[PDB]
Coordinates of C-alpha atoms in Angstrom, one line a residue:
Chain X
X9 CA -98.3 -43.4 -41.5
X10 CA -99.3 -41.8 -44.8
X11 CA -100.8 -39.1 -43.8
X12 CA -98.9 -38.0 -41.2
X13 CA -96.1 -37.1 -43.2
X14 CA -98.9 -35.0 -45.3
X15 CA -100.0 -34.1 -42.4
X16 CA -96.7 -32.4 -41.8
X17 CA -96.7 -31.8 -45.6
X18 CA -99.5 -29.9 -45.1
X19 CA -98.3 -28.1 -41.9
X20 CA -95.5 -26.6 -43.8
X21 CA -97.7 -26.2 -47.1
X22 CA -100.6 -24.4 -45.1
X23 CA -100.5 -22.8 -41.9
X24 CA -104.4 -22.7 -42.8
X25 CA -106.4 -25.5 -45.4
X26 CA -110.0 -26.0 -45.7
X27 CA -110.7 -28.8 -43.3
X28 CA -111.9 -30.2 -46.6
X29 CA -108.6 -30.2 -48.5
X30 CA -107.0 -31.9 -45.4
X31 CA -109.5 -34.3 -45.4
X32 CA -109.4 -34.5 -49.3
X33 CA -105.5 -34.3 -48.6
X34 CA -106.2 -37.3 -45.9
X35 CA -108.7 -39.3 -48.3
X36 CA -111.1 -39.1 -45.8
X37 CA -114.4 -39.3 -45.7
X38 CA -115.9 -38.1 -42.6
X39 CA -113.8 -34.8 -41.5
X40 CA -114.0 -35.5 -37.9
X41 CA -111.7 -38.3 -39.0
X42 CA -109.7 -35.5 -39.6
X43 CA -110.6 -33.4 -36.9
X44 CA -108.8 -36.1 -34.6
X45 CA -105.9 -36.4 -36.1
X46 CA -105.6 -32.4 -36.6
X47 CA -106.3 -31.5 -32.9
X48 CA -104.0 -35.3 -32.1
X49 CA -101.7 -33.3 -34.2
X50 CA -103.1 -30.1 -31.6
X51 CA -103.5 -27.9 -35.2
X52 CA -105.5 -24.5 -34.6
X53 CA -109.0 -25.3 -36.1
X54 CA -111.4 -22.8 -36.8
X55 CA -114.8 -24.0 -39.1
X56 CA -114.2 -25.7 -42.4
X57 CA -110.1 -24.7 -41.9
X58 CA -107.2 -27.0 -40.0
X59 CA -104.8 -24.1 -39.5
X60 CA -101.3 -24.1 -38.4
X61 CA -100.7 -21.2 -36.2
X62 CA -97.5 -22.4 -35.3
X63 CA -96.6 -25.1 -37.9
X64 CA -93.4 -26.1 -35.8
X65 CA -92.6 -27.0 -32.1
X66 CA -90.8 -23.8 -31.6
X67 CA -88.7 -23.2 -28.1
X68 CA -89.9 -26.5 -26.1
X69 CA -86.7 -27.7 -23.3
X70 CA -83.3 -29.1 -25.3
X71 CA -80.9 -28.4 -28.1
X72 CA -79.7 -25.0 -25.5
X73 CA -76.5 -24.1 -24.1
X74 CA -75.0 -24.3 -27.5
X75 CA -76.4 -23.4 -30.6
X76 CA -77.8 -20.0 -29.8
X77 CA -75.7 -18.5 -27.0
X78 CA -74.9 -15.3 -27.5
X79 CA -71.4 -14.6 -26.3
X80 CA -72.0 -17.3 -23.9
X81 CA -71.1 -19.9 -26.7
X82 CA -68.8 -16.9 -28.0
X83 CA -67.2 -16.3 -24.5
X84 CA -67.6 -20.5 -24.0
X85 CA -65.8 -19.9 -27.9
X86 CA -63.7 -16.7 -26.6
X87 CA -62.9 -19.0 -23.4
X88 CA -62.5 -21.8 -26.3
X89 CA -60.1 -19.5 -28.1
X90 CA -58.4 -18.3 -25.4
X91 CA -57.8 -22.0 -24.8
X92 CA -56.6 -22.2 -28.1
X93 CA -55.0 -19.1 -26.7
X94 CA -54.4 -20.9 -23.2
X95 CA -54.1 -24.3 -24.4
X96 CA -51.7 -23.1 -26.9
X97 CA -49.0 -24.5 -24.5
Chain M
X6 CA -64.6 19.3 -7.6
X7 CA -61.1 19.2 -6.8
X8 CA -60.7 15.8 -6.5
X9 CA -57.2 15.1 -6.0
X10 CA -54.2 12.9 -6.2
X11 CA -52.7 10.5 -3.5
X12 CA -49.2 10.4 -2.9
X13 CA -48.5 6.2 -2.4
X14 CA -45.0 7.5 -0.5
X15 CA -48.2 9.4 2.0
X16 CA -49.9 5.8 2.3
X17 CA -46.7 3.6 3.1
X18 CA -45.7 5.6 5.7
X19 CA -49.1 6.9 6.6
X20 CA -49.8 2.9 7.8
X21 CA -45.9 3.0 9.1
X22 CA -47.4 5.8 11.2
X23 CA -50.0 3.2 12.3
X24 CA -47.6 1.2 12.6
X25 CA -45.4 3.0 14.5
X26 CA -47.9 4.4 16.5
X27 CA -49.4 1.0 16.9
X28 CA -52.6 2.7 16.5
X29 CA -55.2 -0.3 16.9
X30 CA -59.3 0.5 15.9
X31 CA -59.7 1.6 19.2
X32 CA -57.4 4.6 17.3
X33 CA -56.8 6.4 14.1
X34 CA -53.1 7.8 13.6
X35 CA -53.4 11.2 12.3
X36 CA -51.5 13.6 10.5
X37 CA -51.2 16.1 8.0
X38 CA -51.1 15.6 4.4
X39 CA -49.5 17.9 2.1
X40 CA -49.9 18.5 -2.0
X41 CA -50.9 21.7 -3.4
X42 CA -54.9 22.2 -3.2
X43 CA -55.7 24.9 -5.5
X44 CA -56.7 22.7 -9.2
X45 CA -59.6 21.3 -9.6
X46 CA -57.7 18.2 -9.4
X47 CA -55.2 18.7 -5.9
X48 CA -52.2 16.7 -5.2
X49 CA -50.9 14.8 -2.1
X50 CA -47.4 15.0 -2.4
X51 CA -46.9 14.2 1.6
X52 CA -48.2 13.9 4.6
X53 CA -47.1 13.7 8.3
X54 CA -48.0 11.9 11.5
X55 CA -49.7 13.9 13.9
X56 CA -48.6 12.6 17.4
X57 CA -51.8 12.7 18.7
X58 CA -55.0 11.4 20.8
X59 CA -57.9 9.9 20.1
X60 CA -61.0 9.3 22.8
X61 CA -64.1 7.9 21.7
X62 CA -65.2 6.6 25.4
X63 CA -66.1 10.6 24.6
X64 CA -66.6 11.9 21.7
X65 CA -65.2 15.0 21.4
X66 CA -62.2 14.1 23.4
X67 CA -58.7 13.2 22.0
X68 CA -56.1 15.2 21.9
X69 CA -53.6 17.3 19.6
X70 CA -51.2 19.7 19.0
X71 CA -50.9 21.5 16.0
X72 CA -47.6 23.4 16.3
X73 CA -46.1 20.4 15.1
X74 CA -47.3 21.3 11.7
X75 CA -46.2 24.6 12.5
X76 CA -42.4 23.8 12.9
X77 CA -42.8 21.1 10.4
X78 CA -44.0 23.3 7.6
X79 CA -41.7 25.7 7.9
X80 CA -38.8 22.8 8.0
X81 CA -41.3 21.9 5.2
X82 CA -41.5 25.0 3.5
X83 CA -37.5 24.7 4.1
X84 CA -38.0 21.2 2.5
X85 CA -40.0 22.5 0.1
X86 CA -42.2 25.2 -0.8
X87 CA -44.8 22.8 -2.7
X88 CA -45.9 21.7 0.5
X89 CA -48.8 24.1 1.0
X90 CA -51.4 22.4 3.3
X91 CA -53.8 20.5 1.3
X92 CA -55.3 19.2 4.1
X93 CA -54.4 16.1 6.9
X94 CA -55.0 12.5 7.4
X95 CA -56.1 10.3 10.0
X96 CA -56.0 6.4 9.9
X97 CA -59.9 5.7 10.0
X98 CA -61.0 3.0 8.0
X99 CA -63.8 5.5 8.7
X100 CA -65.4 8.9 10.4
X101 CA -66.0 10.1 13.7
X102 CA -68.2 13.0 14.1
X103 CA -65.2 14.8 16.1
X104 CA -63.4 14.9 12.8
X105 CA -65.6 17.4 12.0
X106 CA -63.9 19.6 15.0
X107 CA -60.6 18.3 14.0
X108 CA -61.4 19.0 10.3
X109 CA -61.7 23.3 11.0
X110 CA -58.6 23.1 12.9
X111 CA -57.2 23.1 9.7
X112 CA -59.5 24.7 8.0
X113 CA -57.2 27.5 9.9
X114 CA -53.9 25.9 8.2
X115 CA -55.1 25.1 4.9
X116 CA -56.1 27.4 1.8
X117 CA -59.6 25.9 0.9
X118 CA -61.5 23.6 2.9
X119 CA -58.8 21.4 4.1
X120 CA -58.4 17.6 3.1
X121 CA -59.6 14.6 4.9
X122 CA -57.8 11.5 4.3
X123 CA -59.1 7.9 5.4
X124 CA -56.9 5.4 5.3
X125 CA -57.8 1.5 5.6
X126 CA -55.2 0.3 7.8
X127 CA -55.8 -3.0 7.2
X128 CA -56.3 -2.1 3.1
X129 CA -59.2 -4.8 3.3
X130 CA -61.6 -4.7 0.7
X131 CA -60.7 -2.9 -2.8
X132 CA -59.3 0.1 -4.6
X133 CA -58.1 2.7 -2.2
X134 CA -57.6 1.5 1.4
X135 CA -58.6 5.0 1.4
X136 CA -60.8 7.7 2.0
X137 CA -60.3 11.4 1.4
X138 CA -63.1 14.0 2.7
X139 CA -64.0 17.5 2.5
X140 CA -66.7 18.8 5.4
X141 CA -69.5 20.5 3.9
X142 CA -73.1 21.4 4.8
X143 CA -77.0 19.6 7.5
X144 CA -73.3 20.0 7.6
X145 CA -71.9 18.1 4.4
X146 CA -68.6 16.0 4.0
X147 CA -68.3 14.5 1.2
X148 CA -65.5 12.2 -0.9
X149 CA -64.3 13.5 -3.9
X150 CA -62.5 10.0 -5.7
X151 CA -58.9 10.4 -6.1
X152 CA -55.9 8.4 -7.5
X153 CA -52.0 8.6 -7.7
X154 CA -49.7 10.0 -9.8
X155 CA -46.3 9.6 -11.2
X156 CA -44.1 9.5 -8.9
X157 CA -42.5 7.3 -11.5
X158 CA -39.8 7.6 -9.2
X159 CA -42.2 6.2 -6.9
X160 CA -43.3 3.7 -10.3
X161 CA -39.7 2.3 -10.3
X162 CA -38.9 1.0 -7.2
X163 CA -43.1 0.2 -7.2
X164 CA -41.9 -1.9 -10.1
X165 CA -39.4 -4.1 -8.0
X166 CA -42.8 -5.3 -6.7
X167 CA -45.6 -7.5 -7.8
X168 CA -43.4 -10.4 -8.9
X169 CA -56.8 -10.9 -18.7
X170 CA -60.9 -10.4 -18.4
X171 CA -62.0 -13.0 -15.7
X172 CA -61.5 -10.7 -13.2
X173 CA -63.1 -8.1 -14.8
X174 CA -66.4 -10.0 -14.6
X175 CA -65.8 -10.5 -11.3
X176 CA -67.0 -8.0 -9.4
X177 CA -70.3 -8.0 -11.4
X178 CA -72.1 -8.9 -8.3
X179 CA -70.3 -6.7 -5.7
X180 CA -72.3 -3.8 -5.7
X181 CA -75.3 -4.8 -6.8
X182 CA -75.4 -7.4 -3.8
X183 CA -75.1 -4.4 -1.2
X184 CA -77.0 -2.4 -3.5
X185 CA -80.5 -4.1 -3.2
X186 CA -79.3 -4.3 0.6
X187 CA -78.1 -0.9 0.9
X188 CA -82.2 0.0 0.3
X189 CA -83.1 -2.8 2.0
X190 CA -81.0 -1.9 5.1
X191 CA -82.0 2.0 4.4
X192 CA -85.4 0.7 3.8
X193 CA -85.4 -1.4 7.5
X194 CA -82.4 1.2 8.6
X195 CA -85.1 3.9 8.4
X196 CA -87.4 0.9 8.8
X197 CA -82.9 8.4 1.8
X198 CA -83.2 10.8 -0.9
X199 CA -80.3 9.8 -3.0
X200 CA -81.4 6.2 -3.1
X201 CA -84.0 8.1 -5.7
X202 CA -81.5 10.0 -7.1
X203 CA -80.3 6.3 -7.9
X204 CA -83.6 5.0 -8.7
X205 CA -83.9 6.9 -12.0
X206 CA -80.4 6.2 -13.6
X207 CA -81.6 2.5 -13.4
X208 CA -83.0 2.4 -16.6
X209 CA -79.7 3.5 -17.2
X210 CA -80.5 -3.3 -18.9
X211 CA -83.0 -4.9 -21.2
X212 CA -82.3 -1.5 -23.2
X213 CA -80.9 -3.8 -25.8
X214 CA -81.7 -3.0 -30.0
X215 CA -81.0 -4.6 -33.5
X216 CA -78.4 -2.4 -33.0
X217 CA -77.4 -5.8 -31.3
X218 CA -77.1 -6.8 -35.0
X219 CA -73.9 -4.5 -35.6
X220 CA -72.2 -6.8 -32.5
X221 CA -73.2 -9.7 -34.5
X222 CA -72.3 -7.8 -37.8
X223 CA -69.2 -6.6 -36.0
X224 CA -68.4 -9.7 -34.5
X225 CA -67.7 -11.4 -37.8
X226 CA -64.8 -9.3 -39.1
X227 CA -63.7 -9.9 -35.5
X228 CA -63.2 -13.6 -36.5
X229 CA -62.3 -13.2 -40.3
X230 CA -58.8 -12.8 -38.7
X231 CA -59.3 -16.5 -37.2
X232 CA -58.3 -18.0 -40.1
X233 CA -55.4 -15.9 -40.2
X234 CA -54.8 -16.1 -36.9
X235 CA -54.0 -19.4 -37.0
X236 CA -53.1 -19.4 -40.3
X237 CA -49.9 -18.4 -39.8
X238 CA -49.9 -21.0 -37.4
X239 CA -51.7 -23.6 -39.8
X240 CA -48.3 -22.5 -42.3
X241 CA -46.0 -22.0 -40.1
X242 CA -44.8 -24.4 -37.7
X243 CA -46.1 -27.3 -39.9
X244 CA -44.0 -26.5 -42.6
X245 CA -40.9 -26.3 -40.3
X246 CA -40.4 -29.5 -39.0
X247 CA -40.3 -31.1 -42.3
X248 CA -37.3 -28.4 -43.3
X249 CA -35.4 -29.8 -40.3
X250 CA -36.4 -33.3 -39.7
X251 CA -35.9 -34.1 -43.5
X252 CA -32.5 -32.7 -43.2
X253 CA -32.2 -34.6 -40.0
X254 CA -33.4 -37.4 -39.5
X255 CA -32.0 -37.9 -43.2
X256 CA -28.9 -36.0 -42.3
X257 CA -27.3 -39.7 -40.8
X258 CA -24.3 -40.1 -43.5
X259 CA -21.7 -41.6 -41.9
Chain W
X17 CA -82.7 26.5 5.3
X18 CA -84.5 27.3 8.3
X19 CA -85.0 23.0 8.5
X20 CA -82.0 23.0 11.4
X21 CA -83.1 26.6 12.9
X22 CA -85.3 29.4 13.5
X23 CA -87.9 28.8 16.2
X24 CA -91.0 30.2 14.7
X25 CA -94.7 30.7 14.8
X26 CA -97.6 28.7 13.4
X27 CA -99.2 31.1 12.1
X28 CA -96.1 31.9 10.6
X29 CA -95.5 28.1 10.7
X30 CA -98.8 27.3 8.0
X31 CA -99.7 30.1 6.4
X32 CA -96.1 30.2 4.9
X33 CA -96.2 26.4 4.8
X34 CA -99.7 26.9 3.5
X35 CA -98.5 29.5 1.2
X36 CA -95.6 27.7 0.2
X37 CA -98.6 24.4 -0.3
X38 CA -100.0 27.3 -2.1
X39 CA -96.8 28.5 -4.1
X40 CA -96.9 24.6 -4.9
X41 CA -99.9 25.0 -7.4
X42 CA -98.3 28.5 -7.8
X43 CA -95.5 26.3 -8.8
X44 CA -97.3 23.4 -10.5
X45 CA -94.5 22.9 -11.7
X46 CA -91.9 20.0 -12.3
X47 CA -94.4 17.9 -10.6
X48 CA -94.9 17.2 -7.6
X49 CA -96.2 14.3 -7.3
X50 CA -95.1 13.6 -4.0
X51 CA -93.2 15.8 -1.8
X52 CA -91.7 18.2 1.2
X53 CA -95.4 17.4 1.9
X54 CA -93.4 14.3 4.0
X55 CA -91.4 17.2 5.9
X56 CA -93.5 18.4 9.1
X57 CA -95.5 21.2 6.8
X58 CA -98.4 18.5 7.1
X59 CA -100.1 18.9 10.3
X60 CA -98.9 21.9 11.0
X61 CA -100.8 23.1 7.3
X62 CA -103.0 20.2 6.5
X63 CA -105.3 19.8 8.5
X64 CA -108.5 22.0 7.0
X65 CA -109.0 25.0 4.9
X66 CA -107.6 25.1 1.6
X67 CA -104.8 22.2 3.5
X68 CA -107.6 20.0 3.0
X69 CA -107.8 21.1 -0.9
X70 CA -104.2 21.5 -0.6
X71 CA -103.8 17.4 1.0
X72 CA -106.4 16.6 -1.7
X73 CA -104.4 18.4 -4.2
X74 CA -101.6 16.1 -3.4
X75 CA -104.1 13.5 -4.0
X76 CA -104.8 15.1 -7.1
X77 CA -101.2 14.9 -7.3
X78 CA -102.1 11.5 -7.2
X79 CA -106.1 11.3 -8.1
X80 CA -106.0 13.6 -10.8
X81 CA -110.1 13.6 -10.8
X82 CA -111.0 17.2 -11.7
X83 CA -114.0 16.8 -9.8
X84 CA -112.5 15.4 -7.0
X85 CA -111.1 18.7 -6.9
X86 CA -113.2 20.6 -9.7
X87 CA -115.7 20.3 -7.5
X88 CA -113.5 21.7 -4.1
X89 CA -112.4 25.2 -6.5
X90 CA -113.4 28.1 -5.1
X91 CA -112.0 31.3 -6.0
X92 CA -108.4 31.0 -4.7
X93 CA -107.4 27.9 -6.9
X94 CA -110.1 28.9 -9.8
X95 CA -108.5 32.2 -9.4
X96 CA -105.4 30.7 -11.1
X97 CA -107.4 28.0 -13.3
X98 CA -104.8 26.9 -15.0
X99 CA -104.2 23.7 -12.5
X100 CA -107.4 22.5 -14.5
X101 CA -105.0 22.5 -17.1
X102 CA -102.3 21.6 -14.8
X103 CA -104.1 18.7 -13.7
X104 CA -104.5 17.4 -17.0
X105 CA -101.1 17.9 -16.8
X106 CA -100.8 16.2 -14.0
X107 CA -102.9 13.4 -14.8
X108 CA -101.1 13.1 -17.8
X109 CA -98.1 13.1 -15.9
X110 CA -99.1 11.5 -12.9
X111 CA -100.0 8.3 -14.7
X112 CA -97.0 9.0 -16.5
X113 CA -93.9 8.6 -13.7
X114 CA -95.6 5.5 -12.8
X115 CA -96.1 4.3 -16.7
X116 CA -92.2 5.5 -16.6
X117 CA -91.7 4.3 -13.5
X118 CA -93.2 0.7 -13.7
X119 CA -95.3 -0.5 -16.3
X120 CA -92.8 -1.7 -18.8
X121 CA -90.5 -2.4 -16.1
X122 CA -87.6 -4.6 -19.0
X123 CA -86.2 -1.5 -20.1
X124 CA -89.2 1.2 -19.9
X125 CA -89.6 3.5 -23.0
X126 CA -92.4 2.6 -25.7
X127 CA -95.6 4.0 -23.8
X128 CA -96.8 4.5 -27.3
X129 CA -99.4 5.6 -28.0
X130 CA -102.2 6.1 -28.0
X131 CA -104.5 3.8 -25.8
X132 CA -101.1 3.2 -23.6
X133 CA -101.5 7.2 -23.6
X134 CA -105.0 6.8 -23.3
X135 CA -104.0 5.2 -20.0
X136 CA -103.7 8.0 -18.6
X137 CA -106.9 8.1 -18.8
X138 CA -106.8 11.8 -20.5
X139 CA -107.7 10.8 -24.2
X140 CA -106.2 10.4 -27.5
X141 CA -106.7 14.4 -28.6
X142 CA -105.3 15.5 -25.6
X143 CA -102.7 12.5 -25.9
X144 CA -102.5 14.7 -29.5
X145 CA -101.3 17.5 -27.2
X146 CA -100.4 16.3 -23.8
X147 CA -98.7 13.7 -24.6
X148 CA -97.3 15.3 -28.0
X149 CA -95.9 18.0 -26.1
X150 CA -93.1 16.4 -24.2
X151 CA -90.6 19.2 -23.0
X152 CA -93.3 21.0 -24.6
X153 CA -95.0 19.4 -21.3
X154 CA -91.3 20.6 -19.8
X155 CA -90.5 16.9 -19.7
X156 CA -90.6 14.0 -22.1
X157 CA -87.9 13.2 -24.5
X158 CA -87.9 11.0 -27.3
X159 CA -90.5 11.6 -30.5
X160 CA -93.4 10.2 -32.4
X161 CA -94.5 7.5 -34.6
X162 CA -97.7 9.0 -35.2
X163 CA -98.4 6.3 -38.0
X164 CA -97.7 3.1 -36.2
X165 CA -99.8 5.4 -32.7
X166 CA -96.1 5.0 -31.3
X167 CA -93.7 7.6 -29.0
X168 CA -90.5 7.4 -29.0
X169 CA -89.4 8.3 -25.2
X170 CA -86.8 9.0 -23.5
X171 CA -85.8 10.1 -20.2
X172 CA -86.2 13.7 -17.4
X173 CA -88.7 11.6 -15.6
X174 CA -86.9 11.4 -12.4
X175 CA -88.4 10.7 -8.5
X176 CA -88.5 10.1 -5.1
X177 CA -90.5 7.5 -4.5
X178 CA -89.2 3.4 -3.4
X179 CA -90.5 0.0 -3.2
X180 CA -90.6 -1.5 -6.4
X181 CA -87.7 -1.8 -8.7
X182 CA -85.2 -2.7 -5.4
X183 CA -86.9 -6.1 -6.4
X184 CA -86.4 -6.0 -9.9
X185 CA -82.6 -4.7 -9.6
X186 CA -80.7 -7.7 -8.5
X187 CA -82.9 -10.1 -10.4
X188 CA -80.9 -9.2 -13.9
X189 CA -78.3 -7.7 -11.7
X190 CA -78.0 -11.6 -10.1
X191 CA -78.8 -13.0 -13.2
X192 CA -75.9 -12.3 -15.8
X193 CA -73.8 -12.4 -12.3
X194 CA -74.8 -15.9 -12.5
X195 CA -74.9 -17.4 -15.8
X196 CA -71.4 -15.3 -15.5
X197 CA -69.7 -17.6 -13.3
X198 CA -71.0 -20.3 -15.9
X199 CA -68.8 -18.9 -18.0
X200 CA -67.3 -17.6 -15.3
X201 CA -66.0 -20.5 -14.3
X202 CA -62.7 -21.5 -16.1
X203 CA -62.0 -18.7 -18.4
X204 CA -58.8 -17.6 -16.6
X205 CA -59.1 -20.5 -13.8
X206 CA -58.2 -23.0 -16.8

C-alpha cells in the first residue's frame, strides 16, 4: 500500500528508473519482486530500467461529452446561452 | 454567364397558368418569359402563358403557336419596351428532349440563346421551384442559378405574407446523402466525367490547423462580453425591484 | 468533335488515333494517366505495333518500369527520349495522383519527404529534383521543409478516376451530420 503510491510517485518522478532504484525505491530485495508489481502496474520495462512510457491512463472510455467538446460543449454552451437567450423568458 | 433574375410576379402566375390551364404531369404549361437578356446577369421581368400542347405518348409531338407572342409583344412592346424576349417558360418540374425543338423556336424570337424556365408546380423540395436553362452543345443545356430582384413593389405586398441557426445545420446531410448516391446510382446507373471534376474539390475536411487555436483564441473575446452581457442584467433588473418594492410595499401610509 | 460524326476509315481511324496515342507521348504532358484511351481509339489502335507499346505505355502510365518499356524503345519513342525522362516523371507522378489521391486520405497534403517521396519509388536525388520541382514538374504546389525531409503541398492534382473516396465522403459527411442532430437536437426545437 506503500509502495504503490511510490509506485505512482515514481511514475510521475520517472517515466524511466533503474529497476534498481525502484526496487531500492520499493525496499526490495529481489527485483523480480519488482518486476511484478511494475508489469501488475503494466510499466514499460526494458533491462535494469522500469520505464513509464505513458505514466498516466490517457483517453480510456468516460469523463466525455463534456469537458473537451469543442463547440459541441460550446454549441451544448451556445444552445446553453441561447437558453439563457431562449430561457430568458 | 448570364445568369439571370426571376420575376416572383412570372412564378405566381406562371403556376396560375398551371393552374388555369390545369396542366397536370401528364403536362407542362408553357409560355414566354420576358426580362431583358443582354448582362451577364439577365432579368425576368414577365412572362406569359403559351396556350399550348404537350404529347409525350410521342415525343416530339405537342403543339404551339407562336404568333401569340407575336401580337403579345407588340401589345408588349405597347406595354412596355423592356420586354425584349429573354427567353419562355414551361411548367416542368423537369425536361423533355422536345424542349430542345421548342427551345430554337425561340431562339428565332429571342436575342441570345433564349431562356428556359422550369417551374416546380408543386414547389416541392427547396429554393427555386424552379429551373431556368439555356441549350447548348453533344448538344449542351445547361442552368445558370438565378434569383429575384426588387420588385420591392413586389417586396411589399410579399411582406403582407409570412405571418436563428438550427436550420442552418439542417441541411448538412441533404446533399451529401444523394451525393454518395448520386455516384453510386451513376456508378450502378452506368453500372460520368464531372463526378471527377467533383472528386478533386473534395479535399476541398480534416484540413483543420493550430490555426484552430485562433477559434479558441478568438473564441474567448467572444465571451469576455458574457460577463457584460449579463451584467447589465446581473445590475440591472436586480437593482430595480428594490427601488419600487421598497417604495411599495413600504408605500402603505394610510 | 468528330465523336458524334464523320464516318471514317481505319486506317484513317488508328493511325490518327495511333498518332494522336502517339501525340500522347508527343504530349506527355499534364499526365495522362488514364484516359480517351476508354473512348473506342483502343481496339481500333491497340491492338499491336507501337499500340502495344502505346497500351503498355498507358501501363507505363501506370507501371512506370523503364524496362518494362526501356526495354520495348526502338527508334520512334527513343527518337524523342525524353519519355525516359517523362516517365520518371511519370513515375514520380504516377505514384503521385494516387499518394494525392489516397494515401493520406484525412485531409491529403504532407507527402513529405523524402522516403514518402521515395515511394515513388524514384529516389531521394531525383525526389531532390522531381519531387522539388513541383510546377517546376508543371504541377505541385505547396513548398519544402528540406530540414525536417518535409513538402509542403498543395493542390493541381486533379483526375478522372472513381471508386474510392465515394466511401470515405459520407463517412465525415454523415458523421458531423450526426453528432449534429446531438446538438442538433433542441437548439431551436427548445
Amino acid at each position: 500500500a506503500i509502495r504503490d503510491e511510490i509506485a505512482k510517485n515514481t511514475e510521475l518522478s520517472y517515466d524511466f528508473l533503474p529497476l534498481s532504484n525502484i526496487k531500492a525505491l520499493l525496499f526490495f530485495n529481489n527485483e523480480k519482486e519488482t518486476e511484478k508489481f511494475a508489469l501488475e502496474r503494466n510499466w514499460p520495462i526494458v533491462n535494469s530500467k522500469v520505464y513509464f512510457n505513458n505514466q498516466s491512463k490517457e483517453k480510456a472510455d468516460y469523463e466525455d461529452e463534456m469537458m473537451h467538446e469543442e463547440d459541441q460543449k460550446t454549441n451544448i454552451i451556445e444552445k446553453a446561452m441561447d437558453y439563457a437567450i431562449s430561457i430568458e423568458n | 454567364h448570364e445568369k439571370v433574375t426571376i420575376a416572383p410576379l412570372v412564378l405566381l402566375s406562371a403556376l396560375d397558368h398551371y393552374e388555369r390551364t390545369q396542366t397536370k404531369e401528364n403536362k407542362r404549361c408553357v409560355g414566354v418569359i420576358l426580362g431583358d437578356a443582354n448582362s451577364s446577369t439577365i432579368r425576368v421581368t414577365n412572362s406569359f402563358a403559351l396556350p399550348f400542347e404537350e404529347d409525350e405518348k410521342n415525343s416530339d409531338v405537342w403543339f404551339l403557336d407562336h404568333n401569340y407572342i407575336e401580337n403579345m409583344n407588340e401589345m408588349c412592346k405597347k406595354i412596355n419596351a423592356k420586354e425584349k424576349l429573354i427567353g419562355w417558360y414551361h411548367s416542368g418540374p423537369k425536361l423533355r428532349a422536345s424542349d430542345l425543338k421548342i427551345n430554337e423556336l425561340f431562339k428565332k424570337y429571342t436575342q441570345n440563346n433564349p431562356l428556359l424556365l422550369i417551374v416546380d408546380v408543386k414547389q416541392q423540395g427547396v429554393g427555386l421551384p424552379t429551373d431556368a436553362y439555356v441549350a447548348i452543345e453533344e448538344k449542351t443545356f445547361l442552368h445558370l442559378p438565378c434569383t429575384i430582384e426588387a420588385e420591392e413593389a413586389e417586396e411589399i405586398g410579399v411582406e403582407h405574407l409570412l405571418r436563428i441557426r438550427l436550420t442552418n445545420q439542417l441541411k448538412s446531410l441533404k446533399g451529401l446523402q444523394s451525393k454518395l448516391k448520386d455516384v453510386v446510382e451513376y456508378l450502378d446507373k452506368v453500372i460520368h466525367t464531372i463526378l471527377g471534376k467533383l472528386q478533386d474539390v473534395f479535399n476541398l475536411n480534416n484540413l483543420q490547423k493550430a490555426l484552430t487555436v485562433k477559434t479558441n483564441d478568438e473564441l474567448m473575446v467572444i465571451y469576455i462580453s458574457n460577463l457584460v452581457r449579463s451584467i447589465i442584467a446581473f445590475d440591472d433588473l436586480i437593482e430595480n425591484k428594490i427601488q419600487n418594492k421598497k417604495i411599495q410595499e413600504q408605500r402603505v401610509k394610510d | 468533335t468528330l465523336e458524334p460524326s464523320t464516318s471514317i476509315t481505319l486506317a484513317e481511324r488508328q493511325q490518327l488515333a495511333y498518332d494522336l496515342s502517339i501525340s500522347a507521348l508527343l504530349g506527355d504532358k499534364i499526365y495522362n494517366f488514364g484516359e480517351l484511351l476508354h473512348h473506342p481509339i483502343m481496339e481500333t489502335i491497340v491492338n499491336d505495333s507501337n499500340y502495344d507499346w502505346l497500351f503498355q505505355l498507358l501501363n507505363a502510365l501506370t507501371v512506370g518500369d523503364f524496362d518494362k518499356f526501356d526495354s520495348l524503345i526502338k527508334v520512334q519513342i527513343s527518337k524523342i527520349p525524353i519519355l525516359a525522362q517523362h516517365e520518371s516523371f511519370l513515375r514520380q507522378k504516377i505514384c503521385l495522383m494516387t499518394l494525392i489521391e489516397t494515401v493520406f486520405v484525412k485531409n491529403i497534403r504532407m507527402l513529405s519527404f523524402e522516403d514518402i517521396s521515395k515511394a515513388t519509388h524514384l529516389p531521394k536525388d531525383n525526389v531532390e529534383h522531381l519531387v522539388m520541382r513541383a510546377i517546376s514538374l508543371g504541377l505541385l504546389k505547396g513548398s519544402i521543409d528540406q530540414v525536417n525531409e518535409l513538402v509542403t503541398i498543395s493542390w493541381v492534382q486533379p483526375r478522372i478516376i472513381s471508386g474510392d473516396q465515394i466511401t470515405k465522403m459520407k463517412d465525415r459527411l454523415v458523421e458531423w451530420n450526426d453528432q449534429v442532430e446531438k446538438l442538433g437536437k433542441k437548439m431551436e426545437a427548445r
